[PDB]
């Protein structure tokens, strides 16, 4: 896990943001790793963005460290679960596409390019960008 | 810390709730220990109650264990900060009274005896129950 972590950490820039969404070994539970490259963010603003996605926030674990150039970076492990009414993935390809769309959507939400509303849930419902 | 923890844990009952609010060694930062005696609660419902209090949720740390009678209990450490416009405590007595009112208010919020709105902020603003 250290190889993937330092690779994503080094690829970050000033005030950069990275997300990786994977599935937990159990059923209907996902792990989202959220990397903040330079500045820390509180949960009261980080949670509503994921709430608009339609998933339920279950657990959070914070971490932090310093990069090679002295840039402090933060890592947040989110154990989340999507809404039961959300359809499943017929294959691994659908899971991969949904993960990519989810990461891009939340990244857009953080930058303020969109609004915070339940319309975002359609990304995981109708398979839209 | 173990003496105070097991004392509060043993005093709990089925589906009981306990809160202890203390001040961190730094300035304008508080630590709230939230003990759930029997059932686990997600952050998506535990956070709005504290949001209505007027404080900003900064960090959360989860823990769990089993009691002597086999009852599983959960502990949540919340590192929070009140709103800057909220007045300070002129003495330790005001801090103690505010902590007692805060604990009682949030305990009432969890039981559903009140509503979730910004009116609750007056508890920490005008010193009301």
Q: What is the Cα–Cα distance from B66 to B72, expressed in whole angstroms?
A: 4
Tokens 């996902």 -> residue:
A30
Between CA B101 and CA B91 the distance in angstroms is 16
B41 interfacial to chain A (CB closer than 8 Å): no
Residue B42 forms contact with A (CB below 8 Å): yes
Tally Cβ neighbours within 10 Å of residue A120. 23
Distance CA A39, CA B65 (A): 34
Token pair of A15 as six digits: 């005030």
Q: What are phi and psi of A127, to 5 degrees?
A: 65, 45
C-alpha distances in Å from residue A19, one per residue of A12, A35, A54, A106? 11, 6, 17, 8
**A18-22: long-range contacts, CB 8 A cutoff, minimum separation 24:** A19/A102, A19/A103, A19/A106, A19/A107, A20/A103, A21/A99, A21/A102, A21/A103, A22/A99
CB contact under 8 A, A58 and B47: no
Q: Solving technique for this entry? A: cryo-EM
Report the residue count for chain B: 129
Give the integer Cα–Cα distance in Å for A88 and A85.
9
Sheet holding A72-82, edge to edge: A16-23, A30-37, A72-82, A55-66
Do the chains contact at B44 and A59, CB–CB below 8 Å?
no
Cβ-count burial B95-126 (b if 16+ within 10 Å, e if not):
beebbebbbebbeebbeeeeeeeeebbebbee
Report CA Rg, chain B: 15
Q: How far apart are CA B129 and CA B124, in angstroms?
A: 9
Look at the block and give the residue holding tokens 């999507």.
A82
Tell me the C-alpha distance between B97 and A34, whole Å.
Answer: 39
Contacts of B44 in chain A (CB under 8 A): 47, 51, 56-57
Contact criterion met (CB < 8 Å) for A47 and B43: yes
- How distant, in Å, are the alpha carbons of B24, B39, B81 from that of B2? 18, 21, 25
Q: For residues B120 and B108, give the distance between their C-alpha atoms in angstroms, rounded to a whole number.
A: 11
| Strand runs labelled E in B1-129 | 16-23, 30-37, 55-66, 72-82
Helical residues (DSSP H) of A1-129, grouped into ranges: 2-10, 43-52, 92-110, 122-125
Q: Which residues in A81-91 are b (16+ Cβ under 10 Å) and which e? A: bbeeeeeeeee
The answer to whether residue A58 neighbours chain B at the CB level (below 8 Å) is yes
């Amino acid at each position: 896990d250290a190889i993937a972590d330092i690779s994503l950490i080094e690829a970050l820039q000033d005030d950069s943001v990275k997300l990786v969404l994977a599935d937990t070994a159990e059923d209907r539970v996902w792990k989202l790793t959220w990397y903040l490259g330079g500045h820390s963010a509180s949960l009261s603003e980080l949670l509503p963005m994921l709430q608009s996605m339609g998933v339920v926030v279950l657990e959070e674990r914070p971490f932090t460290l310093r990069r090679t150039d002295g840039l402090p970076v933060w890592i947040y492990q989110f154990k989340i679960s999507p809404h039961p009414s959300i359809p499943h993935a017929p294959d691994a390809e659908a899971q991969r596409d949904t993960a990519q769309r989810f990461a891009d959507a939340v990244t857009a939400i953080w930058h303020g390019r969109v609004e915070i509303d339940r319309f975002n849930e359609l990304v995981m419902r109708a398979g839209l960008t």
